[PDB]
Amino acid sequence: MKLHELKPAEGSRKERNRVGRGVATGNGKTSGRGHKGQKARSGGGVRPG
Amino acid sequence: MRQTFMANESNIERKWYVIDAEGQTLGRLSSEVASILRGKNKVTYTPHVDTGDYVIVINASKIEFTGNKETDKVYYRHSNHPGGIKSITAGELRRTNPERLIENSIKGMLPSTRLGEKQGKKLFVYGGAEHPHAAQQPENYELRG
Amino acid sequence: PRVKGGTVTRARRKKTIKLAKGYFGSKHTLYKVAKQQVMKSGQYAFRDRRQRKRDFRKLWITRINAAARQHEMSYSRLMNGLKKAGIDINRKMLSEIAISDEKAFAQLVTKAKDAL
Amino acid sequence: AVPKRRTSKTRKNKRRTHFKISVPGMTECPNCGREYKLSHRVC
Amino acid sequence: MFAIIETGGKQIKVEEGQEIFVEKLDVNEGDTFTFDKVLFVGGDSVKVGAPTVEGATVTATVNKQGRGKKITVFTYKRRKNSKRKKGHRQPYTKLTIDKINA
Amino acid sequence: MEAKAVARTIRIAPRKVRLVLDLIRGKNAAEAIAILKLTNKASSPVIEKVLMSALANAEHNYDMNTDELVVKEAYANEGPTLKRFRPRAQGRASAINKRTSHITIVVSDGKE
RNA sequence: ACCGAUAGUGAACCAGUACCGUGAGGGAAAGGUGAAAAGCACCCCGGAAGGGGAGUGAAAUAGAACCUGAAACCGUGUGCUUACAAGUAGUCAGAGCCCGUUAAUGGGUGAUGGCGUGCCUUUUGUAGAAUGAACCGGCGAGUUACGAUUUGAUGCAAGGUU
RNA sequence: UAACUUGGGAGUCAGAACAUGGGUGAUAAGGUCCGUGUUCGAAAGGGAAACAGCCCAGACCACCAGCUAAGGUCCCAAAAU
RNA sequence: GACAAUGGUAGGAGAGCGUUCUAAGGGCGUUGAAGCAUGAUCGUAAGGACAUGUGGAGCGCUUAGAAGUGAGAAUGCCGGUG
Ligand SMILES: [Mg+2]
Ligand SMILES: [Mg+2]
Ligand SMILES: [Mg+2]
Ligand SMILES: [Mg+2]
Numbered sequence: 088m089k090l091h092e093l094k095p096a097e098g099s100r101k102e103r104n105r106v107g108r109g110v111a112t113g114n115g116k117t118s119g120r121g122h123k124g125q126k127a128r129s130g131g132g133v134r135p136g
Numbered sequence: 137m138r139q140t141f142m143a144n145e146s147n148i149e150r151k152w153y154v155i156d157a158e159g160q161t162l163g164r165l166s167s168e169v170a171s172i173l174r175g176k177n178k179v180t181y182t183p184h185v186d187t188g189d190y191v192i193v194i195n196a197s198k199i200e201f202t203g204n205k206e207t208d209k210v211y212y213r214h215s216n217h218p219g220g221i222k223s224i225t226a227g228e229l230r231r232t233n234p235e236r237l238i239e240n241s242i243k244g245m246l247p248s249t250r251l252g253e254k255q256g257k258k259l260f261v262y263g264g265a266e267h268p269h270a271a272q273q274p275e276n277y278e279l280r281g
Numbered sequence: 282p283r284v285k286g287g288t289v290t291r292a293r294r295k296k297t298i299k300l301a302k303g304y305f306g307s308k309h310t311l312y313k314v315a316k317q318q319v320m321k322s323g324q325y326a327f328r329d330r331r332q333r334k335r336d337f338r339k340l341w342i343t344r345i346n347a348a349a350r351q352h353e354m355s356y357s358r359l360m361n362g363l364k365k366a367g368i369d370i371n372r373k374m375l376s377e378i379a380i381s382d383e384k385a386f387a388q389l390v391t392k393a394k395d396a397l
Numbered sequence: 398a399v400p401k402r403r404t405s406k407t408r409k410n411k412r413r414t415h416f417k418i419s420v421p422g423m424t425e426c427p428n429c430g431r432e433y434k435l436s437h438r439v440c
Numbered sequence: 441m442f443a444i445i446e447t448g449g450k451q452i453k454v455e456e457g458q459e460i461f462v463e464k465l466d467v468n469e470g471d472t473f474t475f476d477k478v479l480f481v482g483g484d485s486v487k488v489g490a491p492t493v494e495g496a497t498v499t500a501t502v503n504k505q506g507r508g509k510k511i512t513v514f515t516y517k518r519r520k521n522s523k524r525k526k527g528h529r530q531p532y533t534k535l536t537i538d539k540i541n542a
Numbered sequence: 543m544e545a546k547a548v549a550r551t552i553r554i555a556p557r558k559v560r561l562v563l564d565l566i567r568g569k570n571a572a573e574a575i576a577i578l579k580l581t582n583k584a585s586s587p588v589i590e591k592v593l594m595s596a597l598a599n600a601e602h603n604y605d606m607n608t609d610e611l612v613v614k615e616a617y618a619n620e621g622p623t624l625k626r627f628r629p630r631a632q633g634r635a636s637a638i639n640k641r642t643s644h645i646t647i648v649v650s651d652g653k654e
Numbered sequence: 655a656c657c658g659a660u661a662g663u664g665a666a667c668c669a670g671u672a673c674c675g676u677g678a679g680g681g682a683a684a685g686g687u688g689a690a691a692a693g694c695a696c697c698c699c700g701g702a703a704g705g706g707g708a709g710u711g712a713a714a715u716a717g718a719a720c721c722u723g724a725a726a727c728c729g730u731g732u733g734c735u736u737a738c739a740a741g742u743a744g745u746c747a748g749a750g751c752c753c754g755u756u757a758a759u760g761g762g763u764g765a766u767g768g769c770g771u772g773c774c775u776u777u778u779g780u781a782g783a784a785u786g787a788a789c790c791g792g793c794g795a796g797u798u799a800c801g802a803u804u805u806g807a808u809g810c811a812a813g814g815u816u
Numbered sequence: 817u818a819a820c821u822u823g824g825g826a827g828u829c830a831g832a833a834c835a836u837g838g839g840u841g842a843u844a845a846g847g848u849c850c851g852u853g854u855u856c857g858a859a860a861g862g863g864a865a866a867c868a869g870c871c872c873a874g875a876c877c878a879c880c881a882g883c884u885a886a887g888g889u890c891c892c893a894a895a896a897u
Numbered sequence: 898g899a900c901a902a903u904g905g906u907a908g909g910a911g912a913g914c915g916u917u918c919u920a921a922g923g924g925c926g927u928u929g930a931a932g933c934a935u936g937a938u939c940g941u942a943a944g945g946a947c948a949u950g951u952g953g954a955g956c957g958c959u960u961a962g963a964a965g966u967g968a969g970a971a972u973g974c975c976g977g978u979g
């Protein structure tokens with residue numbers, strides 16, 4: 088490669104998904120609704136009731 | 137939006153016609169006259185302008201009914217004052233100012249719009265057999281239907 | 282590296298607001314109001330194209346009905362008569378003939394009364 | 398009681414159309430060369 | 441002396457000598473297209489076809505092969521979170537007629 | 543050609559000055575000084591001193607005769623407001639805007 | 655591969671200061687003329703303020719509250735338009751009048767017709783008389799570190815790795 | 817023309833009406849609780865004046881082209897005096 | 898070339914637009930940068946140019962890297978103005 092013409096190997100490295108950046112992203116509630124999509128987000132680690 | 141005709145004020149003409157209400161039922165004579173007034177009879181009809189010709193109604197007094205109209209057909213109206221409703225007339229509006237019984241009965245078939253309001257101004261109803269407007273030189277029109 | 286918000290936003294809004302050039306009062310200056318008004322404007326536009334098809338068709342129909350009532354004949358009968366005559370002209374055309382050439386239209390009509 | 402909606406620009410100015418003041422009724426002082434209100438002193 | 445050709449999805453009334461527009465014809469600009477589906481013809485003598493008056497082409501030069509004004513297609517659902525914008529420019533063909541029935 | 547003068551940051555708030563100018567605007571200059579001298583509002587003496595100045599520049603910097611001069615325009619524009627307050631009931635204090643007016647005026651000849 | 659005056663220290667300015675509290679304590683705002691001060695001699699209206707000429711300057715339509723100078727908001731001028739009309743304000747259809755472009759099946763306005771109860775949020779369901787927003791601007795919310803797992807990519811491979 | 821297996825990621829756990837088989841209620845409820853079907857939710861379009869849940873029918877985009885569905889065809893209002 | 902499929906909330910998947918910084922390459926700029934304003938401009942969208950006016954000194958483009966990367970709503974915070 089000539090350095091100003093770098094190319095990452097095909098199939099390596101996809102763009103990270105930024106949630107919460109507008110609606111047509113499909114992610115504007117971010118994810119979930121009204122439960123423990125709360126910021127504590129406590130699934131308790133590994134338990135039911 | 138390409139190719140269909142639309143009629144201008146530059147490109148339009150309204151004839152005058154006279155009509156003998158005598159022997160005619162209210163509703164039928166009415167709807168036909170409305171069709172005349174709205175211009176839906178010329179093929180140069182176009183909705184957004186008045187393509188309608190003028191109508192003069194004659195011998196209005198002699199208009200017909202059926203059933204128990206004259207008695208059972210109340211014409212209510214309300215004065216926008218409390219208890220101000222006034223039925224105070226039946227089909228016997230024909231007996232007293234039938235020019236209005238006919239005028240309102242036809243006007244009631246024209247649209248609420250200001251255009252269909254201005255087309256209602258092209259009507260001229262008279263209970264008597266002779267009319268003022270001979271100066272416009274109307275042609276007689278036989279009701280079809 | 283901190284990224285300032287400059288340009289981009291205000292430009293997006295000036296585009297939106299420019300779309301609202303026709304609008305009354307604040308609908309032509311405030312971004313939000315103009316934005317809502319423009320969205321609704323677009324929805325109206327879409328349905329209104331799909332509508333405008335209808336409106337024009339019904340107009341040609343009524344013109345024809347008029348033109349054939351002139352020849353002592355029902356629109357229903359006129360068109361059924363053409364269809365059984367094998368004539369396949371569109372209504373916009375028939376209204377236009379009825380306005381630009383009375384003779385040819387009458388000729389079509391007498392053609393239509395045949396095969397009945 | 399408080400307004401339920403804000404007054405429009407166009408509205409507010411339609412209301413203001415009767416808010417001018419009168420051009421004074423003004424006779425010219427003879428020979429003194431100034432000017433003054435009608436039926437007032439010539440100063 | 442007008443006449444009626446079935447040319448796009450639809451029918452067209454052309455006075456001969458007249459600029460007209462239609463859906464794209466995939467014909468080279470300046471070359472002369474000849475519409476074969478003629479339905480009717482006006483004037484002093486009036487041929488009126490079944491479908492298609494037999495024979496009788498209408499001829500025209502091709503003028504332009506442009507695309508029309510963009511119209512943005514925007515729509516949305518209220519409250520529920522969705523909207524959709526798409527641009528659109530329908531292609532056309534301007535042609536001017538010469539010698540109807542020729 | 544057609545001379546002007548301006549009074550920046552006049553203490554009177556613009557709505558008021560506009561009430562006077564609107565009488566003044568467009569009239570012949572002489573008439574205007576009269577009307578100005580006879581109206582009873584604060585803006586009247588202010589606008590007076592301004593129209594006088596404008597006539598001065600017009601005679602002096604442009605050699606035109608004063609008599610044929612006409613008030614081509616006059617107008618007041620928002621100028622920065624001094625911001626104060628008055629104390630009110632129960633310890634709240636509410637704002638007062640003492641706003642100001644820039645008063646321009648322009649006199650005239652013909653097109654040339 | 656940190657900030658660039660709402661950022662970065664609370665503090666780029668005589669900041670723990672104005673200001674508040676009895677006190678402990680709490681705690682702001684506020685940077686930019688120009689290359690050079692050359693900071694408008696002089697005349698003019700004015701009590702001054704301010705201003706028009708005359709001038710310095712590349713520029714003062716860079717003049718001190720001074721680079722650029724957006725939007726809200728206030729005004730002057732007007733081309734088209736409006737005083738029989740029931741308006742979520744637009745859209746589709748369309749005369750009339752006026753204009754002339756990033757030249758294209760042009761721009762402004764709009765008599766009249768058809769259609770049409772904003773947006774969020776929350777909801778079984780909101781034109782909703784359920785919630786939020788006076789307007790405009792700036793700022794304002796899935797990050798990083800370290801483990802775990804899985805996918806893709808690459809190097810080797812009964813070996814791989816520090 | 818699907819199914820199932822295994823692995824990464826989910827949201828959901830307030831439902832509503834109409835038909836229909838039933839329990840509770842009063843063969844009361846725009847009632848409540850279950851079975852079945854559809855539609856809404858998450859579905860615009862046409863019809864039912866208007867009218868999420870009814871009837872017709874599922875909108876990639878453009879047209880001033882035709883046929884039809886429910887429902888309609890004297891005037892408002894397209895089409896049968 | 899025919900032939901199909903393309904309503905959609907929670908949500909899954911995919912492909913992209915634009916912001917600032919960096920690397921390298923190739924450029925533009927006092928004969929006028931960015932920014933701001935005006936326009937009938939091009940693209941399927943985010944969005945990209947172009948001319949004129951303003952401004953008076955810094956900017957793009959190509960490829961790849963990395964992000965304090967995108968606002969209309971929080972009785973949001975500060976400023977201005979109704
Ligand atoms: Mg033509
Ligand atoms: Mg009483
Ligand atoms: Mg009488
Ligand atoms: Mg317009």
Ligand SMILES: [Mg+2]
Pocket residue numbers: 319320514
């Ligand atoms: Mg939009």
Ligand SMILES: [Mg+2]
Pocket residue numbers: 553554
């Ligand atoms: Mg004072």
Ligand SMILES: [Mg+2]
Pocket residue numbers: 632633634
């Ligand atoms: Mg207090």
Ligand SMILES: [Mg+2]
Pocket residue numbers: 675
């Ligand atoms: Mg205390």
Ligand SMILES: [Mg+2]
Pocket residue numbers: none
């Ligand atoms: Mg791994």
Ligand SMILES: [Mg+2]
Pocket residue numbers: 829
């Ligand atoms: Mg539960």
Ligand SMILES: [Mg+2]
Pocket residue numbers: none
């Ligand atoms: Mg269910």
Ligand SMILES: [Mg+2]
Pocket residue numbers: none
């Ligand atoms: Mg039951």
Ligand SMILES: [Mg+2]
Pocket residue numbers: none
């Ligand atoms: Mg239940």
Ligand SMILES: [Mg+2]
Pocket residue numbers: 889
């Ligand atoms: Mg019937």
Ligand SMILES: [Mg+2]
Pocket residue numbers: none
């Ligand atoms: Mg019969």
Ligand SMILES: [Mg+2]
Pocket residue numbers: none
């Ligand atoms: Mg850019």
Ligand SMILES: [Mg+2]
Pocket residue numbers: none
């Ligand atoms: Mg450039």
Ligand SMILES: [Mn+2]
Pocket residue numbers: 102103104
């Ligand atoms: Mn992505």
Ligand SMILES: [Mn+2]
Pocket residue numbers: 113114908
């Ligand atoms: Mn989604």
Ligand SMILES: [Mn+2]
Pocket residue numbers: 121
């Ligand atoms: Mn819930």
